[PDB]
mmCIF file of C-alpha atoms in Angstrom:
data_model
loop_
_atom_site.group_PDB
_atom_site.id
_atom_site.type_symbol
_atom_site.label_atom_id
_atom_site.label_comp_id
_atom_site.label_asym_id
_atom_site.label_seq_id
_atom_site.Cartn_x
_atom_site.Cartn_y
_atom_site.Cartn_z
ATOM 1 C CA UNK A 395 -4.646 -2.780 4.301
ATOM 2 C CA UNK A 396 -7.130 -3.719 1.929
ATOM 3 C CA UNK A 397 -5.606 -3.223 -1.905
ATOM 4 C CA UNK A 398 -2.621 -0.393 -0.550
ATOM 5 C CA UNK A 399 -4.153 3.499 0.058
ATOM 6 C CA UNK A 400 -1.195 5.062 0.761
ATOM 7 C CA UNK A 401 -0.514 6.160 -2.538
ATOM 8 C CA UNK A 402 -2.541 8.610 -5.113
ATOM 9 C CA UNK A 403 -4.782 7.082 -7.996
ATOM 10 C CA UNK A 404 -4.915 8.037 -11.544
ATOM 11 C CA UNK A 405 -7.641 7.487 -14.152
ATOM 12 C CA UNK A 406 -7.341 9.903 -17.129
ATOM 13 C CA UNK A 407 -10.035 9.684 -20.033
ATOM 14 C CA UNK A 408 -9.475 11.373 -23.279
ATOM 15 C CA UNK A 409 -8.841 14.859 -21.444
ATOM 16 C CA UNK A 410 -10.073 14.486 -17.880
ATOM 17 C CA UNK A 411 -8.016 13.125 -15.001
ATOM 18 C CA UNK A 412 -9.565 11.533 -11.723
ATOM 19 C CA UNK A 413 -6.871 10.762 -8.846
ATOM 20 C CA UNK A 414 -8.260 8.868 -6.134
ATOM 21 C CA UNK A 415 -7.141 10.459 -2.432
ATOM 22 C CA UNK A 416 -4.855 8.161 -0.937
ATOM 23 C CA UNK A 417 -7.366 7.400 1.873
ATOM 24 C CA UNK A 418 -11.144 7.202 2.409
ATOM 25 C CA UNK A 419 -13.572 9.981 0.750
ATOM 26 C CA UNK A 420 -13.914 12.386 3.240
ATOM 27 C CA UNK A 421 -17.164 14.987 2.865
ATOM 28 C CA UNK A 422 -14.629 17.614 4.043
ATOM 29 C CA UNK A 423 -11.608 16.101 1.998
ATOM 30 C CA UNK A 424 -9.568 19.126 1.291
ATOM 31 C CA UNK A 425 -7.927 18.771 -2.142
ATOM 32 C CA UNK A 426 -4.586 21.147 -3.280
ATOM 33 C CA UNK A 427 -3.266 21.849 -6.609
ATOM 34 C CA UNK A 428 0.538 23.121 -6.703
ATOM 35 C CA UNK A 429 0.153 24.034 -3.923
ATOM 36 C CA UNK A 430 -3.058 25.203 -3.488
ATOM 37 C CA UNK A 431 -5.891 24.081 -1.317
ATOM 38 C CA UNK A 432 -9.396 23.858 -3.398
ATOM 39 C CA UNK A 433 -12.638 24.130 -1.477
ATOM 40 C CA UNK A 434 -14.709 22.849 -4.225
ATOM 41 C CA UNK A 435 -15.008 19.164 -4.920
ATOM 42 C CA UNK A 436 -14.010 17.554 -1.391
ATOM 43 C CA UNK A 437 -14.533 13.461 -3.241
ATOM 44 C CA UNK A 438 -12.149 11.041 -2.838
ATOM 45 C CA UNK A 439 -11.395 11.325 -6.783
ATOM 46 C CA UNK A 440 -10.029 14.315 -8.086
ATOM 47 C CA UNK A 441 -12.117 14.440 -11.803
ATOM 48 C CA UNK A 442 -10.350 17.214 -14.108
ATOM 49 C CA UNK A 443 -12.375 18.051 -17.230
ATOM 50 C CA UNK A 444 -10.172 19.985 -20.324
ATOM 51 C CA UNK A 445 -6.595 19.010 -17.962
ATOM 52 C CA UNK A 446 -4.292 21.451 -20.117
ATOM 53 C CA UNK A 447 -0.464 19.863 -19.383
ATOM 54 C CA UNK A 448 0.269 23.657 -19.767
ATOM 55 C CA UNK A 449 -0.801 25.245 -16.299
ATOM 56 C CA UNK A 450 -3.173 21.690 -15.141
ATOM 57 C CA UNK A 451 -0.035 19.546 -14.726
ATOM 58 C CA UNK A 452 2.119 20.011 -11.393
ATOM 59 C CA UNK A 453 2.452 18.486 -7.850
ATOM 60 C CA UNK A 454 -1.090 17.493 -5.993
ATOM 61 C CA UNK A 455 -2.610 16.609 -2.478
ATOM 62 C CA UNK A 456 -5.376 16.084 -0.491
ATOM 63 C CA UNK A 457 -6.498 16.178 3.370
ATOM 64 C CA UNK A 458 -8.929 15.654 5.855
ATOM 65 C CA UNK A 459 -9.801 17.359 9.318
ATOM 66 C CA UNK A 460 -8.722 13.635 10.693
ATOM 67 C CA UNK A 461 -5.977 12.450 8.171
ATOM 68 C CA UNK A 462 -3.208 14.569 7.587
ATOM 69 C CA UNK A 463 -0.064 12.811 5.366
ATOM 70 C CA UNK A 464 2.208 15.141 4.071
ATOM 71 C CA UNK A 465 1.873 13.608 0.583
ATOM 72 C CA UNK A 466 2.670 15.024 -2.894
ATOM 73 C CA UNK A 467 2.409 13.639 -6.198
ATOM 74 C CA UNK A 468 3.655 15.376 -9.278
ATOM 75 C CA UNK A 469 0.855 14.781 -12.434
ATOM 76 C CA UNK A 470 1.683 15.404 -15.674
ATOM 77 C CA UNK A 471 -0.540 13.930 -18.425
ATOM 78 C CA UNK A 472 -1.193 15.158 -22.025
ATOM 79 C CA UNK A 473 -4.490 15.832 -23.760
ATOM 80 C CA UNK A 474 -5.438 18.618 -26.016
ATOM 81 C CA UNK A 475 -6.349 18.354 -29.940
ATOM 82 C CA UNK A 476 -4.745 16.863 -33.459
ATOM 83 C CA UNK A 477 -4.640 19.968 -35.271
ATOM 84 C CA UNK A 478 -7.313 22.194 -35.141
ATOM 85 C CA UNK A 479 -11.017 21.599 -36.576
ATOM 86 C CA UNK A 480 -13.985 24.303 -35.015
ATOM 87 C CA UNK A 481 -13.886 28.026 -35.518
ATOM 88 C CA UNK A 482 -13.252 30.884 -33.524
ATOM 89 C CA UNK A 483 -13.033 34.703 -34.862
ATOM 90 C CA UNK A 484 -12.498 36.158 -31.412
ATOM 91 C CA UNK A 485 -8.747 35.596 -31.946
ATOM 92 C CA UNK A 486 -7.281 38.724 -29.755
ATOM 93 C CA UNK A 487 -4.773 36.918 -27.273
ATOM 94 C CA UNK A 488 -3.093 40.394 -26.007
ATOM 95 C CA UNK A 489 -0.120 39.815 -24.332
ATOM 96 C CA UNK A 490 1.655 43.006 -24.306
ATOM 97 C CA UNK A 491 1.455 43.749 -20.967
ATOM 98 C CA UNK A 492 3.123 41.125 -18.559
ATOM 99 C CA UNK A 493 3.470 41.575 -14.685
ATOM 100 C CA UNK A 494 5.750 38.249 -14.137
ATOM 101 C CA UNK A 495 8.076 36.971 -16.041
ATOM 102 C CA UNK A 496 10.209 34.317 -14.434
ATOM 103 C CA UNK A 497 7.078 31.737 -13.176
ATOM 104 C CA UNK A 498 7.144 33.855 -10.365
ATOM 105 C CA UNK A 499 10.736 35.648 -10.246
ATOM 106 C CA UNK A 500 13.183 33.809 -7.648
ATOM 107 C CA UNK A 501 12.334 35.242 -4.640
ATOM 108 C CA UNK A 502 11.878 31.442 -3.699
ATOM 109 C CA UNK A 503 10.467 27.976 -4.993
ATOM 110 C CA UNK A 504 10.818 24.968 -2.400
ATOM 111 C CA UNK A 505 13.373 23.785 0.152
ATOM 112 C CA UNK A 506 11.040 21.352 2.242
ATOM 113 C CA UNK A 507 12.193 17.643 3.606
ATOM 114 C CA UNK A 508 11.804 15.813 0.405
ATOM 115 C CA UNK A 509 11.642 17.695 -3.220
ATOM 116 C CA UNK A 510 12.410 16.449 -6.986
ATOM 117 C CA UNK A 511 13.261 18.671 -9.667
ATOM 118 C CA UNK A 512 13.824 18.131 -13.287
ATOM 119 C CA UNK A 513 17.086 19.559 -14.879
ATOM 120 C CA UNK A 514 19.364 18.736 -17.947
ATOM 121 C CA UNK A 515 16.288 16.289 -19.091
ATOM 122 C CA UNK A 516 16.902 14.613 -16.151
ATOM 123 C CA UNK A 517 15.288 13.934 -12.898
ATOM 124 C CA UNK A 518 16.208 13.502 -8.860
ATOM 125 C CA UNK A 519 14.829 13.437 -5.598
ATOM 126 C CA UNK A 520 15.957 15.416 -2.711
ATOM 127 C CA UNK A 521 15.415 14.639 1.331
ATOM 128 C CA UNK A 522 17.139 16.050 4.066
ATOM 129 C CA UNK A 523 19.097 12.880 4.382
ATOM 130 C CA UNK A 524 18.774 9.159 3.461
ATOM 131 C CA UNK A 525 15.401 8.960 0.812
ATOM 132 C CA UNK A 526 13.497 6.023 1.598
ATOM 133 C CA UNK A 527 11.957 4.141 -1.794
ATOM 134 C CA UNK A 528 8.503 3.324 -1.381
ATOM 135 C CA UNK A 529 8.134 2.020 -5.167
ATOM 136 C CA UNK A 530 7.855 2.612 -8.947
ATOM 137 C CA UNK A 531 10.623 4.612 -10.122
ATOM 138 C CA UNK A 532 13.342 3.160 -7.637
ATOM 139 C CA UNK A 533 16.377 4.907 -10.012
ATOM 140 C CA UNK A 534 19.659 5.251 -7.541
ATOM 141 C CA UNK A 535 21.188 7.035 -4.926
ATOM 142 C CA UNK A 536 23.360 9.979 -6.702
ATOM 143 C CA UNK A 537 25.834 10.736 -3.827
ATOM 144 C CA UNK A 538 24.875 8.382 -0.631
ATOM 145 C CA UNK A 539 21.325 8.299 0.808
ATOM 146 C CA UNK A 540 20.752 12.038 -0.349
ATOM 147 C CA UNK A 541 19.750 12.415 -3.629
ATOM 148 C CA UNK A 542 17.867 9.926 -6.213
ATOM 149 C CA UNK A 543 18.712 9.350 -9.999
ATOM 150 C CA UNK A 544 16.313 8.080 -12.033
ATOM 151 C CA UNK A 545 17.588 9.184 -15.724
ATOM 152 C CA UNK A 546 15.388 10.966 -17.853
ATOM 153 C CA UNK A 547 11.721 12.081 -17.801
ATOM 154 C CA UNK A 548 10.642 10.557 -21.527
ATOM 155 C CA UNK A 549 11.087 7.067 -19.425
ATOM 156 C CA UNK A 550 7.867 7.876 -17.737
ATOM 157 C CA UNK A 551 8.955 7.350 -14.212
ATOM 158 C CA UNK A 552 6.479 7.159 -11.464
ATOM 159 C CA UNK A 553 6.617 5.827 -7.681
ATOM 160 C CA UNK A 554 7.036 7.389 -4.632
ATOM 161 C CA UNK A 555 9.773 8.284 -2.015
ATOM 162 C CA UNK A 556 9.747 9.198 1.710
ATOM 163 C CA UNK A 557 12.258 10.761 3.619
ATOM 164 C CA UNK A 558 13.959 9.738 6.523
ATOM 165 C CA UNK A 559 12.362 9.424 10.039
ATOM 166 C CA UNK A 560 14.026 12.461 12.407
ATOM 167 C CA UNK A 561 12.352 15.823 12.364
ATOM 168 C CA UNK A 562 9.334 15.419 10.040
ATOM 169 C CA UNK A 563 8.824 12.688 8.055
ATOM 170 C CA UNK A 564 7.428 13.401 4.338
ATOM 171 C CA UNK A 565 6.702 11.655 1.356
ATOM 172 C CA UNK A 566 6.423 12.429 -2.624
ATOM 173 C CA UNK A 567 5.201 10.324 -5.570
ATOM 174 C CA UNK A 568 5.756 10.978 -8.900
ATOM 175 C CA UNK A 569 3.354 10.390 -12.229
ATOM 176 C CA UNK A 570 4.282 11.084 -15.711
ATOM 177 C CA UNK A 571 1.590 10.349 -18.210
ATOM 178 C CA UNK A 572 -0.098 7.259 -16.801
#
């Protein structure tokens, strides 16, 4: 209750991105990166050197052996190079043989209480019943307490939105570029 820590940080510099934990550094603070827990830099910020938009941008979350907030927040910044300018004659890039090629086929993708997904260039939320808007991108209910509407992703929306209290409450925050 001191400047509001419920919510993820951002703080990108030229390529790098560091996202504050939405609570105190913990020496065991478990970190995850689309889904993925990382064992490797439990801080409080989340520093990302060379953050490719290609395969670094996605959801993220952190945890703690005492603080557990189901918590999500989709990062997407962009950093890379104008043009090119070194050198590089190892230019192979062999591609011919490809064991995926549907990010993963369909055999599934994500179904839990709150989810946003962006189709048509445009972008909703999705809880198990009424969505409760913490902040930022407050766009509008699509049907009734179901779905959100917030209108395109070029508008660089970002806030967050929790689900309803009833059988597991869970909350996601969005970030695009800054």
């Amino acid at each position: 209750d001191d400047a509001e820590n419920i919510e993820y940080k951002v703080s990108i510099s030229g390529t790098s991105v560091e996202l504050t934990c939405p609570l105190d550094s913990d020496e065991n603070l478990k970190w995850e990166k689309n889904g993925q827990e990382l064992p490797q830099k439990h801080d409080k910020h989340l520093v990302l050197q060379d953050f490719s938009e290609v395969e670094d941008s996605g959801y993220y979350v952190c945890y703690t052996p005492a603080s557990n907030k189901n918590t999500y927040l989709y990062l997407k910044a962009r950093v890379g190079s104008a043009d090119d300018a070194k050198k590089d004659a190892a230019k192979k890039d062999d591609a011919k043989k490809d064991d995926a090629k549907k990010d993963g086929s369909q055999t599934n993708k994500a179904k839990r209480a709150l989810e946003v997904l962006e189709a048509e260039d445009k972008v909703i939320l999705k809880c198990n019943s009424s969505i409760t808007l913490l902040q930022g991108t407050a766009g509008q209910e699509v049907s009734d307490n179901k779905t959100l509407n917030l209108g395109k992703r070029i508008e660089d929306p970002r806030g967050m939105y929790q689900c309803g209290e009833n059988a597991k409450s869970f909350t996601l925050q969005v970030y695009y570029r800054m």
